[PDB]
Design a protein around this ligand. Structure first.
Ligand SMILES: *C(=O)CCCCCCCCCCCCC
Lengths: 202, 34
């Protein structure tokens, strides 16, 4: 129930590499996967676009209960398909728009926009972005990270890399979820790890 | 061009700005995995 406003809950998020050995055999590797401490949002403003409709403008518009910060410890240890899959629940039947902006030094480099419709499910409604192609920039970025001899060098690069995800009701233009993503490379036994935080005004 | 900037970034960290995250007011769980 962690990444959830009062109008939308992201139950699932994953980014992955799938390889097809042969027409009947598939191998999937997860870079990150999600399946409550507060953070002052003003601490991360310089890390995202701050023009009109930027993170600040979005937060001050509200609702303040839609804003989250996720820290990922990404597992980079691995006929190719690079994908992102996410699942959402809402009490309402809506047209949702999902905007994902990749940022470097707080500047947008690439945006992907997806429009999703509801499906009735046990008295509520579900939304799914299934197997969305990971854009060229991110594939190449991942490749360049992988070729670094040292893990701390990877983290140094990621210090100025952020991803901003904004889910919006297309009709009312209400922010349903806003998720700020910060990344490090995982160095553990378990593989990919994460921690979710709520963004607050103070 | 962003591909040329990317290349410069990666050559930079191999052959050695703002306030880094580790110095900011963030919880400890932000920097150490579960
Ligand atoms: C391009 O279309 C932008 C879409 C990017 C979606 C974000 C996927 C998250 C990538 C996590 C991999 C970890 C990289 C260090």
């Amino acid at each position: 129930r962690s990444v959830a406003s009062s109008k939308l809950w992201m139950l699932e998020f994953s980014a992955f590499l799938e390889q097809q050995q042969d027409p009947d055999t598939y191998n999937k590797h997860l870079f990150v996967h999600i399946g409550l401490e507060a953070v002052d949002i003003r601490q991360i403003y310089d890390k995202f676009p701050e023009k009109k409709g930027g993170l600040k403008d979005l937060f001050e518009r509200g609702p303040s209960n839609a804003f989250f910060l996720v820290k990922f410890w990404a597992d980079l240890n691995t006929s190719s398909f690079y994908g992102v899959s996410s699942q959402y629940e809402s009490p309402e039947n809506m047209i949702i728009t999902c905007s994902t902006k990749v940022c470097s030094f707080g500047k947008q480099v690439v945006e992907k926009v997806e429009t999703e419709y509801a499906r009735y499910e046990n008295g509520h409604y579900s939304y799914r972005i299934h197997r969305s192609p990971l854009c060229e920039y991110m594939i190449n970025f991942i490749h360049k990270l992988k070729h670094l001899p040292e893990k701390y060098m990877m983290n140094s690069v990621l210090e100025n890399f952020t991803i901003l995800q904004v889910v919006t009701n297309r009709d009312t233009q209400e922010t349903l979820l806003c998720i700020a993503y910060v990344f490090e490379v995982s160095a553990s036994e378990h593989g990919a790890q994460h921690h979710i935080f709520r963004l607050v005004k103070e | 061009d962003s591909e040329t900037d990317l290349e410069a970034l990666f050559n930079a960290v191999m052959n050695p700005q703002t306030v880094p995250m580790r110095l900011r007011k963030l919880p400890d769980s932000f920097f150490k995995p579960p």
